[PDB]
Amino acid sequence: AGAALQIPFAMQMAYRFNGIGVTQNVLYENQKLIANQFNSAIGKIQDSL
């Protein structure tokens, strides 16, 4: 939408949780589990491929 403006990635993930109706404390208080789940989900794609 213009020039790239940097933001830390967990804070971008919190904006995106807001965009679906969940408060952002739910992301910050679960950060490690959410990242573990994303990593297992990405590791399952290359296994199916």
């Binding site: 939408a1 213009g2 020039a3 403006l5 940097q6 967990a10 952002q24 404390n25 910050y28 208080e29």
Partner: protein
């Protein structure tokens, strides 16, 4: 709100014009400009409680902390009407110490 469906930027409004066998759309959009960098933090710890912005981000100009809206820089001081509380400050990665100002009790002298 569909990205790039009505031009580049944040769609404000669009005007139609007729062409021969066709149509022309003049899209008016909003494009952000002249950014500055800041230090930032996800929450703020005060009295053993974690505070999150209601809307906006916590930013630091070098020595002081403010809340701003995310798309236009307009800094304000962090109060209990700017933020909400959840939990204690032991669980959030990158939490920062600052004071969150209450209006009522300095009204009550």
């Amino acid at each position: 709100k569909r990205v790039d469906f009505c031009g580049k930027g944040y769609h404000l409004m669009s005007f139609p014009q007729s062409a021969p066998h066709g149509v022309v759309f003049l899209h008016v959009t909003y494009v952000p400009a002249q950014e500055k960098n800041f230090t930032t933090a996800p929450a703020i710890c005060h009295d053993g409680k974690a505070h999150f912005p209601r809307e906006g981000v916590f930013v630091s100009n070098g020595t002081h902390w403010f809340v701003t809206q995310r798309n236009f820089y307009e800094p304000q001081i962090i109060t209990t009407d700017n933020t909400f509380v959840s939990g204690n400050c032991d669980v959030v990665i990158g939490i920062v110490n600052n004071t969150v100002y209450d209006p009522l009790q300095p009204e009550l002298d």
